[PDB]
Structure 1
Amino acid sequence: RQRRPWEPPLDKGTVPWLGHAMAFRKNMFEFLKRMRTKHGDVFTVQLGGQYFTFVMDPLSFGSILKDTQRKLDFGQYAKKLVLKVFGYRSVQGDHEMIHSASTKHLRGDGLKDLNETMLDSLSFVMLTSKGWSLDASCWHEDSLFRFCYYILFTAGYLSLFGYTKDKEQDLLQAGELFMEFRKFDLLFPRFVYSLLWPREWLEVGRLQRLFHKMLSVSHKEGISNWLGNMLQFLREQGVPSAMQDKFNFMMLWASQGNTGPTSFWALLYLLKHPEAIRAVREEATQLGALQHTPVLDSVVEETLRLRAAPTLLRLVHEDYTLKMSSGQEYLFRHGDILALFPYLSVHMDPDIHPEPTVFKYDRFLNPNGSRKVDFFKTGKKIHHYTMPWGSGVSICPGRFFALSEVKLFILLMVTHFDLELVDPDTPLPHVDPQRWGFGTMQPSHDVRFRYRLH
């Protein structure tokens, strides 16, 4: 490949036949931060098989995301990734069904009835798993991360994949899944980056087989319409049950992979900021009133802005031409992968968000407590001031549910428990760089905390 005058800078690496994969994988955020100050807001690098052109200009997102002339493409590429990662063979129309089923059952009225179930599941797990001693003034010490990610996982899983007559049994099996899930979660980045030793390549195999069996379609009662609907579609289309198993696990990964970790960060920030936790507690003291919790909404967004860091990817279907804010005209070859990293471009942009590495619980609140949606860069409007879900038809179709899960979890935690960090003086764990780009980040080290009934 050779750069043409109208294309953006192409950096092949100092060891040209090794490229930038190694530095990219070690720390993607830092890597992109260094390439930006070297080449500017647009550049091309070869990673894995493909060529990636990173667009780091916040101002160009609106143009790219809304593909006026349909030059870009998400679906085709998405197809390629789930196959290689999960081994799922897409069928004609299954995507359409996912988002069709999501809106019908993960939003509006389907969501209301589902949230009911969540609350029941979320209360059951929290009451039953907290830990007890005959002394009710007895603090219990746990690691905050594993705690939030176990509660959110078990509850979300039972709310979506169903349960049986013996409630306690289900919580037990849900907890067993969680342990295995966490092992797979820990390996996932190095699995996708193909940076694993033989023992781990086999471990990932054992976990995938195990998850296929446990969620097997050849087996409860009362599962979410969301899942019930999809599986049914698959069944009608003639998808073998063995492939249905692989779908169920992919959906498990999507629905439970980020909710827990998000809850962890959101709660940890509240513990590290007395004024923020006061703000939500006072708001919390007044069945289905998620609609009137603006302070908690701001707190969740401010958590997502600080810890959600996915990568927006688009295959260039036919040659794309983008005019930059500055004024250049760049060309993108068909077959190139146009890529956005909203975390660096938008979340940490100090001009869009001043003091960006700081947790400001009221960041998305207006002086009059209203919802704030007016953000600018160099005086210029920004519609995507936070992109923790994606955009277009790649956007997380369960985002409204995920928000219900996280808000509900917080409320119950701050409301009925006394919370304290074991080493409040030690500063917060930073992001594990291994995961940059994979949804919600996970901490570099674990935080101990203690709790008890109020």
Structure 2
Amino acid sequence: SRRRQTGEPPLENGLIPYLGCALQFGANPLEFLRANQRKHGHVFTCKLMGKYVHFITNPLSYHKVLCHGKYFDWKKFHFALSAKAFGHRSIDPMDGNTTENINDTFIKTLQGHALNSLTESMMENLQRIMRTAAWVTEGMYSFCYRVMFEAGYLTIFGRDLTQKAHILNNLDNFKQFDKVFPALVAGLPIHMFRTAHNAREKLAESLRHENLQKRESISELISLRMFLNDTLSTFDDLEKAKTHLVVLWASQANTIPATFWSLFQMIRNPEAMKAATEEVKRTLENAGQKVSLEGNPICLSQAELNDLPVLDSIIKESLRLSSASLNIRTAKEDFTLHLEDGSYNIRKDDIIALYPQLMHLDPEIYPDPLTFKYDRYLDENGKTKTTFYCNGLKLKYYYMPFGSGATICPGRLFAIHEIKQFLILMLSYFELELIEGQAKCPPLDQSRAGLGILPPLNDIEFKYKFKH
């Protein structure tokens, strides 16, 4: 076994060989870390699934970790996770299967100019899917899944302009595969889950280059990713298809619960709904956009979308409460980490992690942290508030659902645009209400801890009726 040495943080080895604290950590991730915070302070080491994870819990120490250091490796763990879960060979250039910098691929196609067409495509696709008036009762999460999945799929992978059952099949397959994702990350083989195994292979088949080339309006991302698969990799046809499944999962898995919580919190709070309705009404008027189901589709520019402070605040506050990401980096060699709490010795191949849900729900940073306050990221005038403090010091990192530094989601700008577009269209098309307005906020499904946004454990019913 491993023993704590000179300078090294307090070590918690756990009661199980290999797993260590994994079981206890999985049982209640936030309370497990909070209990270790009381027992060991802001810096402690946990043996998890064969690894030794140093947790940095002081929000004032996040900057020393999120920096581009010569001792950190921020790809090796992610690349391995992807390989195991999606069933492709190593995408690490050191392994010689590809020479592609996937980070460069994502930057080039999810940001800058590429973002314009991608944003424009999402708005067209959403409107295609969403367009005597009667009240339709449905599960809010079920609704958000239908709408966001189909729109997201068509925006990223283009349209087959030749078929409704096929969209429904991909939808169902994705639900079946995504259901066992926490187990796949843990190390359990997909073979063990027959339904999910078949689902993953069916998803992969439809994303083969031969099937993708037959589609209209493919994203610059996938068309670049196809080109680089052929030019810079030695992957087989199915492996190439599985690299597109990684991108499908990445574009859907966090957007769907993110969309649910934003929609839910906006309707649940009458104050948030009234403000958002007025903002969308104001924005559409100034852009000369008329909401008509039979006429021409609405068009909003990136500039118009980025100037929605109320919606931005609603999304940010929705993510603040539901984000459960695990910010990880690995030690390249043995070194000493210098933090506000002290100096700690870290060994080679050790993991240095952040669980920013500890910060998002910190009462010292966010007063009444478990309450949804729609204007939490707004000032007196109604402009985005970027100043948050912690024990007197102004915080550089205060909101991290997409991560930060080099370990940041490249799809963040698109993610916020597509949620905004869904909310704009939902407010413009329908009259919205809940089955039980005075019903409790659903508990977060903790089985998805470390994988991004936590979905609700149980779905909430809601009603919608198109406007005249």
Q: How would you bin the TM-score normalised by the shorter chain?
A: over 0.9
Q: Kindly indicate whether residue 171 of structure 2 is the aligned counterpart of residue 178 of structure 1.
A: yes
Q: CA deviation at 1:96?
A: 5.3
Which residue is equivalent to 1:105? 109
Mapped partners of 2:345, 2:227: distance in 1? 44
Aligned residues of 1:296 and 1:407 also touching (Cα < 8 A)? yes
Mapped partners of 2:280, 2:19: distance in 1? 54
Q: Which amino acid aligns with 1:302?
A: E
Q: Kindly indicate whether residue 441 of structure 2 is the aligned counterpart of residue 437 of structure 1.
A: no
Which residue is equivalent to 1:296? 311
Alignment of 1:45-194 (within 5 A): 45-68=46-69, 70-89=70-89, 90=91, 92=93, 97-127=101-131, 135-136=132-133, 138-166=134-162, 169=163, 171-194=164-187
CA shift in 2, pair 1:18/1:145, >3 Å? closer
CA shift in 2, pair 1:48/1:439, >3 Å? same
Q: Kindly indicate whether residue 279 of structure 2 is the aligned counterpart of residue 283 of structure 1.
A: yes
Which residue is equivalent to 2:402? 389
Mapped partners of 1:178, 1:406: distance in 2? 19
When structure 1 is superposed on structure 2, of 442-451 and 211-220 the one drifting more is 211-220
CA distances 1:271-324 after superposition (whole Å, capped 9, x unpaired):
110000111110111222203211111111111111122100111112232233
**Structure 1 vs Structure 2: percent identity of aligned residues?**
37
Which residue is equivalent to 2:351? 337
Match of 2:199 among 204, 207, 219: 207
Which residue is equivalent to 1:131? none
Mapped partners of 1:95, 1:29: distance in 2? 38
Match of 2:229 among 234, 241, 266: 234
Q: Which amino acid aligns with 2:367?
A: P
SS at match of 1:309: strand
Segments of structure 1 that go 5 or more residues without pairing to the other structure are 128-134
Aligned residues of 2:64 and 2:339 also touching (Cα < 8 A)? no
Which residue is equivalent to 1:130? none
Which residue is equivalent to 2:327? 312
Q: CA deviation at 1:195?
A: 6.3
Which residue is equivalent to 1:420? 433
SS at match of 1:451: strand
Mapped partners of 1:259, 1:25: distance in 2? 23
Q: CA deviation at 1:13?
A: 2.6
Aligned residues of 1:218 and 1:241 also touching (Cα < 8 A)? no
Aligned residues of 1:151 and 1:260 also touching (Cα < 8 A)? no
Which residue is equivalent to 2:43? 42
CA distances 1:171-217 after superposition (whole Å, capped 9, x unpaired):
54222211111122222113322568x98533332122111112122
Which residue is equivalent to 2:242? 246
Aligned residues of 1:374 and 1:381 also touching (Cα < 8 A)? yes
SS at match of 2:124: helix
Aligned residues of 2:205 and 2:238 also touching (Cα < 8 A)? no
Match of 1:447 among 460, 463, 467: 460
CA shift in 2, pair 1:52/1:95, >3 Å? farther
Which residue is equivalent to 1:268? 264
Aligned residues of 2:329 and 2:351 also touching (Cα < 8 A)? yes
> Could you tell me the TM-score, scaled by structure 2's length?
0.89
Alignment of 1:371-386 (within 5 A): 371-386=384-399
Which residue is equivalent to 1:255? 251
| Cα RMSD (Å) | 1.9
CA distances 1:400-431 after superposition (whole Å, capped 9, x unpaired):
11111100001110222111111222211010
SS at match of 2:387: coil
Q: Which amino acid aligns with 1:48?
A: M
Which residue is equivalent to 2:20? 19
Aligned residues of 1:27 and 1:436 also touching (Cα < 8 A)? no
CA distances 1:346-377 after superposition (whole Å, capped 9, x unpaired):
10111111111111111111111111111110
CA shift in 2, pair 1:52/1:126, >3 Å? same
SS at match of 1:264: helix
Q: CA deviation at 1:444?
A: 1.2
Aligned residues of 2:174 and 2:200 also touching (Cα < 8 A)? no
SS at match of 1:266: helix
Which residue is equivalent to 2:290? none
Aligned residues of 2:11 and 2:44 also touching (Cα < 8 A)? yes
Q: CA deviation at 1:440?
A: 0.8
Q: CA deviation at 1:87?
A: 2.1
> Could you tell me the TM-score, scaled by structure 1's length?
0.92
CA shift in 2, pair 1:208/1:376, >3 Å? same
Which residue is equivalent to 2:210? 218
Q: CA deviation at 1:248?
A: 0.9
CA distances 1:55-79 after superposition (whole Å, capped 9, x unpaired):
11111111111134x1111112222
Q: Which amino acid aligns with 2:86?
A: F
Mapped partners of 2:222, 2:202: distance in 1? 19
Q: Which amino acid aligns with 1:115?
A: T
Aligned residues of 1:97 and 1:230 also touching (Cα < 8 A)? no
Q: Kindly indicate whether residue 359 of structure 2 is the aligned counterpart of residue 351 of structure 1.
A: no
SS at match of 2:328: strand
Mapped partners of 2:77, 2:143: distance in 1? 35
Aligned residues of 1:352 and 1:375 also touching (Cα < 8 A)? yes
CA distances 1:129-168 after superposition (whole Å, capped 9, x unpaired):
xxxxxx31x10000000101221111011011011223xx
Mapped partners of 1:66, 1:255: distance in 2? 26
Aligned residues of 1:310 and 1:341 also touching (Cα < 8 A)? yes
Q: Which amino acid aligns with 1:377?
A: C
Which residue is equivalent to 1:132? none
SS at match of 2:54: strand
Mapped partners of 2:333, 2:187: distance in 1? 30
Q: Which amino acid aligns with 2:252?
A: Q
Which residue is equivalent to 2:291? none
